[PDB]
């Protein structure tokens, strides 16, 4: 319905010894609580990540954008994780080397026009090296405010 819901509790720092699935369940958790996705959303993102990985080997901060099928989404939402230390995602391009991910953009979008808008915003944002480093030092409020400003465009 064109809007993207992004709330202050959709931004979190994660503990160190978290696996890939741990991350995915933790980022999907506030989306589930808010009723923005089906209740077993994490399972679908996990299963999708295994066959179609979402790691982007960009420098200096590795990124992933895990997601699943739009038919599991109820309202557009985005969920953001900051990793204490890298966790490998497989490379979205089919390179053998894993991606040491520090920043995770979980996407729960059901509108095609919002999907493409967000993907394009992410490609731009991850090439802003100052901004990507900032994400590793800012707290949750500064991350939310920072992303909110840049996303609000549409």
């Amino acid at each position: 319905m064109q809007g993207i819901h992004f709330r202050r509790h959709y931004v979190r720092h994660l503990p160190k010894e978290v696996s890939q699935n741990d991350i995915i369940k933790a980022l999907a958790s506030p989306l589930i609580n808010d009723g923005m996705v089906v209740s077993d959303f994490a399972d679908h993102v996990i299963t999708r990540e295994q066959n179609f990985p979402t790691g982007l080997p960009v420098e200096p901060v590795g990124v992933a954008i895990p997601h699943t099928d739009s038919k599991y989404v109820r309202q557009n939402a985005i969920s953001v994780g900051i990793l204490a230390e890298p966790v490998n995602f497989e490379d979205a391009g089919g390179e053998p080397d894993p991606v040491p991910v520090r920043v995770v953009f979980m996407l729960a979008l059901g509108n095609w026009f919002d999907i493409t808008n967000v993907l394009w915003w992410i490609k731009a944002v991850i090439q802003d090296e100052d901004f990507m480093q900032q994400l590793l030092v800012m707290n949750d409020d500064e991350i939310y405010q920072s992303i909110y400003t840049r996303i609000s465009e549409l």
Epitope: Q2, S70, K71, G110, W112, F113, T116, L119, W120, K123
Partner: antibody, heavy 131, light 110 residues
Framework: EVQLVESGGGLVKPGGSLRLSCSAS????????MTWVRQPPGKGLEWVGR??????????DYAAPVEGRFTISRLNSINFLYLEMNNLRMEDSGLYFC??????????????????????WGRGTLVTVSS | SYELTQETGVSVALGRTVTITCRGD??????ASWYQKKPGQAPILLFY???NRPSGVPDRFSGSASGNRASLTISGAQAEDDAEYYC????????????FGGGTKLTVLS
């Protein structure tokens, strides 16, 4: 074997109205984006308009010469797509096609809102607008 | 051929290779998709995006893209390839509308 079957075309006077139908089978219609396309006599394909899916609140977009006059709707319970045409003009004459519509966006090189392509097509229904 | 411009007509000897082109400013931002059509028959999706070919489409059909140009190469034209070919894309960079090229009549000297 996807099946698309258009009907309703016929002779109309300029200023008149006409309602096209598109029967659809063999795929997930309720989630399919659907496009109407037309070929005026002896000319090429012309994009008419397109209706999206549930994730997009079933929004519709129209070709410039056709906005306001044409209406694209759907009833998913019977897998039917419709095109409502009012205040018809000579140059509205043509073979009208319905088409199951896919969506494409390449992450690294793409630009919003990506592109739409037409993977399945019906055989058409003929519209003649004339005095 | 309004926003998207195609050659009116091109011919190619049977067996030989021919590239047909599609030009417009929106192609600087958007990929084109390609369609074959013959009189009396429904169109057929040949190619779309960066490098996608539907199954059942012969591999002699290949699309590519550069600058404001999209192109469809037919490598070793058969008789049944004698047809009209249409390109399609956004009418404008960033647009939700779509548009077709005016079409190219390809004659295969068979």
């Amino acid at each position: 074997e996807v099946q698309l079957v258009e009907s309703g075309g016929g002779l109309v006077k300029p200023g008149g109205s006409l309602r096209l139908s598109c029967s659809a089978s063999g795929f997930d219609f309720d989630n399919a984006w659907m496009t109407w396309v037309r070929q005026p006599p002896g000319k090429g394909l012309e994009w008419v308009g397109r209706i999206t899916g549930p994730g997009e609140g079933w929004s519709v977009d129209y070709a410039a010469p056709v906005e306001g006059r044409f209406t694209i709707s759907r009833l998913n319970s019977i897998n039917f797509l419709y095109l409502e045409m009012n205040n018809l003009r000579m140059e509205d004459s043509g073979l009208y096609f319905c088409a199951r519509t896919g969506k494409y966006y390449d992450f690294w090189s793409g630009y919003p809102p990506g592109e739409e392509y037409f993977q399945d097509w019906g055989r058409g229904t003929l519209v003649t607008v004339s005095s | 051929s309004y926003e998207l411009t195609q050659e009116t007509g091109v011919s190619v000897a049977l067996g030989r290779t021919v590239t047909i082109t599609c030009r417009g400013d929106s192609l600087r931002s958007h990929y084109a998709s390609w369609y074959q059509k013959k009189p009396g028959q429904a169109p057929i999706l040949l190619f779309y995006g960066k490098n996608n070919r539907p199954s059942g489409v012969p591999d002699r059909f290949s699309g590519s893209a550069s600058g404001n140009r999209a192109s469809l190469t037919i490598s070793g034209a058969q008789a049944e390839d004698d047809a009209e070919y249409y390109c399609s894309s956004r009418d404008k960079s960033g647009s939700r509308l779509s548009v077709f090229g005016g079409g190219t009549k390809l004659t295969v000297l068979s």
